[PDB]
Subunit: 104 residues, 4 copies
């Protein structure tokens, strides 16, 4: 019967190419991915949001809090700039779930 296709952006980008987001390790590569994600996709997928949360918590795990601050500040800018409420809510979720691991 009728169906919708939920395509993971980060799965595609990883398929096209140690804390990494869709394979990207360096901050300039990571911000290129996040820019393409936020500006190209209209509805962020749960999988992709959770893949970003894992990247951030992996940064916390390897104590690279410098990169984490850059990643969060960049996402804050782009996602809060968005006219779409889904991207505003996606940021709150990412932030709230990162804060929890930081506060441990």
């Amino acid at each position: 019967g009728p169906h919708m296709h939920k395509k993971s952006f980060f799965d595609k980008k990883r398929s096209e190419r140690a804390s990494n987001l869709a394979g990207a390790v360096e901050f300039n590569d990571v911000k290129t991915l996040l820019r393409e994600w936020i500006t190209t996709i209209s509805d962020p997928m749960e999988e992709d949001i959770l893949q970003v949360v894992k990247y951030c918590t992996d940064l916390i795990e390897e104590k690279d809090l410098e990169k984490l601050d850059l990643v969060i500040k960049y996402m804050k800018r782009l996602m809060q700039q968005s006219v779409e409420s889904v991207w505003n809510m996606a940021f709150d979720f990412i932030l709230d779930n990162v804060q929890v691991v930081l506060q441990q």
Copy 2:
């Protein structure tokens, strides 16, 4: 680990009433149907695939019982409310509902 909760609007509403024949979350009559519709587009910021597909089924069930008259109203109502949203997710949800309904109508 971290998680998101995808709650079905029409499942909730069917639990609150529920059922009375073609229905949307239990609602059979147009005036109770446009009401469940009314409440969905207006409250929910991100529509769920389940709810979108529950609407498509209702519409195709109308086509099935040849109630093309009620179907005209149901689509005409959603065409009104969904197209007039600022959120792209609701614009895309309408295209999907329409495109899938048109296919069955065009048969």
Copy 3:
């Protein structure tokens, strides 16, 4: 492209008809639904498993721990009787998630 349909058993049963499972309030009605679910369906759906967990936590909420014990003991029997690992795992998940709410 190709796709799979996840069909909710409890949604169907509710459609065909204050703590309730697919509309059923009385224990004899609830055990009839659970019997039909476990003995009729080959692969339990996440939605249906979570709909059972909600019913069980709603019982805890209205302090009807008598009904809850009957519901769990009945599901233990039927789901552990199953040859299919999916039904065995579905029970563990329901039990583990009910214990959490009981322990609160």
Copy 4:
């Protein structure tokens, strides 16, 4: 509230590493992945089943019908050998969806 985690096996294996299954191109690599998937996982995920269907259709796309026959014959053996009905049904779905693309 209560939740289930659907972890993609092939996403994990691709993350740990032109037609490929989770990065694996050569048949011995592909059969190693399929063996670990079928023998390690109790309930196959929709995403992973659809990732296998995409690999087979990608083989059809590059006209490598030799590799496709090896992949299907191997999956037939392992998935039909399984005690779990979910794996028997997963094979039928993969085969039926491959036949559709072959019939085009």
